[model samples]
Structures are given as structure tokens and as C-alpha cells.
Target chain A: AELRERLLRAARWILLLGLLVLVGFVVLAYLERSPLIRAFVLSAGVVLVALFAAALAWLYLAAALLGRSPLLALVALALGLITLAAASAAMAATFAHLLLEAPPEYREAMLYVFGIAVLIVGLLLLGLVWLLEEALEALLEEEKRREEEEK
Target chain B: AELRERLLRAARWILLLGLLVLVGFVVLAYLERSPLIRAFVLSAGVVLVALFAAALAWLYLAAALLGRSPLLALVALALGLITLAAASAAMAATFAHLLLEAPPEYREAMLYVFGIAVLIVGLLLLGLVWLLEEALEALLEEEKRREEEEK
Candidate 1:
């Protein structure tokens, strides 16, 4: 019970932070001149907004539903992670565009940055998969235990 | 085992369809006049191509690995759905642009067309979700049955 409350509290804070990030991105979208950057900022902002909305909706459902639906929580978790991953990917693409279009003399540095950015997003994707697997395994284990007890 | 093979066969056909769609989109991209339409075509082409690639990879793994790894299959399914959904959404956006930019008299017709298009896509998304849930439930049921037999 205590832990669930803490989690709900954390979710509220996360939602607030996401809203701020979205607002910042909106400002960037208005101020930025480059179409590519503006597109990236706006799309990223939308993703952030979606992630927060899903998170908040999941929290409310979990609270109201007696926290019995792991599947709903899993879907919400996947939605948030996918949104974040997409935003990260969009930013990476924007960076790649800037880096690859730079002057010839700085191409090497830009290439390095591009590689690092790609690597970071790759790790993020891997982390998401690992977490998903862990969640699935836990759910399966619970199901198995329940079945065994019934038997 | 027979079901798995059948699923693999279906996936292969889906991949072929995806490839054909990608090729058509590529042609559309090259022929498109408006910059917005061109962008949409190119992005949609990329997504369809990615979907085919992921589907092929999953089919290969499912065949070689004896379809034991549900996780890999789930990932592939998700990648395909995301790609398809993104492509669909892009086309919807393009249609919206057409609808909004049409002359006053044609605007109503465009709006009607847009409504039909959205209805179709909405149904497609619902079908996809239903299919996904069915697949997941089947996998879980099989796993549960296997555990019961072992016990």
C-alpha cells in the first residue's frame, strides 16, 4: 500500500515534468527557424504529451481497478516506452541531419557524434526489451504459481 | 507445430505484400509533385520496407528456432504493426492536407472522402489490436498447458 502510494506520487511528478518538457518543446517549435528542427521539436513534444497521458491514465486505472490487471499496466508501460523511444529517435535523426550536413572539415567529429547518438538509442531499445521480458516472466511465474496452488 | 508453420506462411505472404506496398510508395514518392506528399510517400515507403524486413527476419527465426521464442515473434509483430500504423497515419495526414487545401466547393467532398478514409483506418487498427490480443492469449494458453502437462 505504501509502495503503491509512492508510485502514484512519482507518476504525478513525472507527468508534471513531462508537461514542462512538452511546453519547452512547443517554445522551441515556435522559435526554431529550421523546418527539420521545428518538426522534431513538435513531434517530440507530442510524444511526451502522449507518454504522460498514458502514464496518468494507467495510474488512475490501476488505482481504481484494485491493481489486479497486470496486462493493462503492461500495455501502458509499453506505450510510454515506445513514445520515449520514438522521441529519442526523432532527436537522434535531427542530430544526424545536422552532423552529416556539416562542412567537410568537421565530418569526422560529426560522424563520431552520430555514432554515439545511435549507440545510445540502441541501448535504450535493448533496455526496454529486457524490461519487457522481465515483466512477462514475472507474470508467467505468477500464473504458474496460481495454477500449481489450484492443482 | 502445424499452427506455427501456418503462421509463418502467413507472415511470408504479409511480407510480400509489404514489399509491394513499399515499391508502390517509392514510385509515388518519385512521381509526387507536392513536397508534403513526397515526404509522406518516402516515409511511408521506408516504413513498409522496414516492416517487410522485420517480418522476414521473424519468419526466418521462427523457422530456424522451432518457434520456441515467443518474445522474438512478439517483437516482430509489434515492429510490423508500428510500421503499418505509421504508414497509415502518414497517408491520413496527406489526405487531411488535401482536404483542407481544396477549393471551397470541393472541400465538402474531400471532407467526406477523409471521413471514409479515417473510418477504414480506424477499423484496420481495431482489427490489428484484436489480432494481437488473440495471438498473445494463444501463446499464454499454450505455455500454461505445457506447464500443466509437466506437473
Candidate 2:
């Protein structure tokens, strides 16, 4: 419950700040008309938006159905967050690399695009974290509730 | 209570739809002949899944631990959605760019095999977004609850 308790708090701001960042990303994309800037911001923006939508859906589901157990939910939430952190850092670095390194030939650019592929991989790893969270939370909560009902 | 209830109801449908989209992404990845599309959709799918998992965890935690205030859950949920939106767009655009602009040699029919590498980075970005969300949601809920208790 302690860990779950903590993440419930943390998740809120991450969502808000992330939104701000997304907005900034949009601005950044608009401002950075160059292919390099556009590529970096545009790619990042797309990801941020998807993450937001997914999170929103999950939260609603929990409230509607899961009945919200402190212990189980905490575990699910924390694990997910840790995974997401790893994914974000990996993608950020990749994008930064793409931005920093200047590519001239078609090969270089193609190779660079592979970096974008890496970004997606990072995303999956993070998603796994969430999946675990979802499964565990539901499993534990049902068990706990059943026990309580029996008692 | 009304808003919270509304969000809770919304959460369930969101998760269901998100899962559909996630499955869709995987199918898209499998069906696509292009390497770039394969790389983009697969990676994006991973991130999307992870982000939702995290949101589910946090939302339940917030409801359980915080007496269903859902304050933190709401915040984090919003962030998660943003991440999803951003990732999808980013991957799609990059895939298009890579597929269209690459040289014939680099762009073979089996190029998707080469393009799977793209998942790594976007996966990372999703990870970061998850972690930050957890941390923030935890801190904010605790602080707000404390303030209320103190008052």
C-alpha cells in the first residue's frame, strides 16, 4: 500500500507535466521548420500523445471496475512507472543522438531512422511494466476481496 | 463524487478501446510489408501497452489508498494518455519518412527485419514518462491529503 500510495500521487503530475511537454513539443515542432528539428519533435510529440490517451483509459477503467485496492494497485503502479522511466530515457537519448549527429548520405539517414525504431522498442519495454502492474493488481485485489467477502 | 464517478466509468472503456488499438497495432505490424511500418507500429504498440498498464496501477492505488479521491490517479491518467498520443504520431511519421526516402538497396522487401531495431528508443521514452508520473502522483497525493488532514 505504501508504494501504491506513493505512485497515485506521482502519476498525477507526470500526466500534467507530460501534457505541458507535449504542448511544448508542438511548439518546438512548429518553430523548428528544419527537417532535423521537425523530425525530433514530431516523433516525440506523437509518442507523448499516445501515452496520454492510454493512461487516461486505464485510470477510468480502474475507477469503474477494479474497486481500487491500495496494496495491489500500488504494486501495479510502481512497477509500471519504473518501466516507463527506463523507456523514456532510452528514447530521449536516441532522439538526442539523431538530433546531434548530422547525416549526409541516404545510408546515414536510413541508419539514423533505425534509431527511431529503437525508440519504439523502448516504449514496449515500458508497456510491459504496465501490463505486469495491471495483471498483478487485478489478481491481488480479487483475491483480497474474495477473502474479505468470505470472512 | 460525480466527476470522480464519471472518470471511473470512462476508465473502463478507455482500457478496452486501448487494448483494441494495441492489438490493431500488432496486427498492423505483422501485415505490413514495409520494414519501416513494422518497426514503427510494433514499437509504438509496446509503448502504448506499457503506458496503460501504469495508469491502471496508479488509478486503483489512488482510489484505494486515498479514499477514492482519485486526485493523483486523474493527474497521472492524463499524462499517460498524452504519452500514447505522442508515440503513435511519432512512429507513423518516422516510418513514412524512412520508407519513402531510403535508397533501394537499403529499402528491400525484407527491410522490416532490419527496421525492428527502431523500437528501443521509443520504448525508453515511454518508460521515463511512467516513472515520472508515479513519483509525482505519490508526492502530490500525500501532500494534498496531509494538507486536508492538517486543516
Candidate 3:
């Protein structure tokens, strides 16, 4: 369905985005222009996006494992939603206090700041997860083919 | 056997090392103390090692693909060895020209500089390869057990 295709595309982008972040940090560091922060403003936009994906992936995995147990799958799905909301809110509040509330450090800085890095890494992890899942499917298909050949 | 174990362990390390590099670059860049270069001397050690791993992985993949054709596998293996030597030497010479021969760059530079980055990334890619391969094996094994149970 469109849903599965959307998820795969999302995972692919996440991996590439994370890869880009890693490269970005290296280049920026080499140039010596991160940010001069005694304090800074912040945003949770990037972090929340990443966290949502992570939570989604987690729930997906848990549900797969709990396929034989309806109760378990329901519990996992419920907790995943709760965690995603709580985590995102908590992160936003923390970002406000830690940077937006502080003072006196300035230079070329990312508006989203370090959360983007976390986001990127999260994206990468999810990408890897999806890639591995696909590889497993590919392997199973090959196995099925081999079995048929034997017959 | 011993060979497979060695390869797996090596792949694991490569992935970890690459992860370290990505982290290192971000940290160093954020600190803004990467190295100031009017000019710099260089080393080939890191780059060559990475290239070797990359070439090894390439050859291994090629050999796997050519498994049903001995003549093809031999050709791939031979070319792999040749590329390994040619690429490594070519890289060494290029590094010499690019940095060591340049002028007036100075700061807390990595003696290994960028090659190490390449090396670390190479390690990461190889690690990903191994992880996926193992996951594929796990999937196939499960398929076997399922098929047996059905029988």
C-alpha cells in the first residue's frame, strides 16, 4: 500500500540526512565556526521529528514480536504513543531552559542546534533498521526460491 | 572458520571506528579548533588502511557474485589485487602533493588529517555490510525452521 512505500522513502531520507549531518559537522569543525555559546535560543522541531520516527519504529518492532498476543501488542502501542508525546514535550521544555533562557554566545549557529545532530543520528539508525529489515525479506525470498528449486 | 571470524571482527571494528570519526568531526568542528592551515605535512597510513579494507570488501563482493564462474572469480580477484596496489600508491602520491608540498598552514591539525576520516567511514560501511549479512542469515535460518515445522 501507499503507507508502506511512504515509510520506506522516509527511512531512506533519514539515513541520508544523518550521513549529511556527520559530514556537515566535520566540515564546519574544520573551518572552526561552530557556535560561541554562553547561552542560546533553541527549537524542538528537528528533535521531535526524530523522536517520533524512533518511537514509531519501536512500536512497529514490538508489535511484530507480539503478533501472537493481542494484549501485548496493544500495550506496546499504547506505551509508544505515551512515550512519544512525553518525550517530545520534555525535550522542548528542556531546550527552552538550557539555551533559549541562557545568554551570551554567538556565531554561525544552527537554529535547531544540536537536536538536529540527534535527529540526524536518529534518522540514520532508523534507516539502518529499515535497510536490515528489507535485507531479511530479500533473504527469505531467496530461501523460498531455493526450496522450490529442490522440489 | 577462522577466516570468517576474522572478517566479522574486522567489520565490527570498522563500523565502530567510523562512528567514532563522525562523532569526532562534529565535536572538533563545534569547538572550532580543527587546524589552521597555511600549509601542512601529511601521512598516508590511515588512508591506505581504509583503502585496503574498501578494496578487500569490493573483492569479496565480486568473488561472491562470481562464485559459479571460476574464471570470472579469478579475474575479479586478480584485478582486485591490482587495484589495491595501484589505488594505494596513487593515493599516497596524491596526499604528498596535496598537503605535504603545500605551504603555510598551521594549528592543532590531525597528522592523519582527512585520510583517517575516509578510513573511519570505510570501517563503518564494512560494518554495515557485515551486520546486514548476518541479519540475512538469521532470516534464512528462521525460514528453514518454519519450513521444517510445516513439513
DockQ, per-model, please?
0.03, 0.14, 0.01
Instruction: Highest TM-score: give the candidate number.
Output: 1
C-alpha RMSD values across all candidates: 13.1, 12.9, 14.9
Evaluate all candidate structures by whole-model CA lDDT and list the values in order: 0.50, 0.50, 0.42
Task: Give each model a TM-score.
Answer: 0.38, 0.37, 0.36
- Order the candidate numbers by DockQ, best to worst: 2, 1, 3
Tens digits of per-residue lDDT, candidate 2, A58-140, equal: 44333322334555454544544554555556555655555455455533543444464455445544553664465465567
Candidate 3 docking quality: incorrect, acceptable, medium or high: incorrect
lDDT of 3 by residue, A1-151 (tens): 1324544565566556544554555454445443443122212334544664675575455446344543333334333433443344345334422432233243124323444433433343334334433432333354356668999
Q: Write the per-residue lDDT of candidate 1 for residues B9-112, one digit (tens) a residue.
A: 65666667666766766776676556655665566456545644554564455445436655445444544444444544455445544544555454444444
Cα error, candidate 2, residue B9 (Å): 1.6
User: Which residue ranges in model 2 land beyond 4 Å of their true spot?
Assistant: A1-37, A43-97, A104-151, B1-7, B68-151
- Model 1 residue runs over 4 Å out of place are A1-151, B5-68
| Candidate that scores best on DockQ | 2
Better of 2 and 3 by lDDT: 2
Quality of model 3 by C-alpha lDDT: 0.42
**Residues B55-126 of candidate 3: C-alpha lDDT, one tens digit per residue:** 434433332333234445445445544554555455545544454533344212533554553454454445
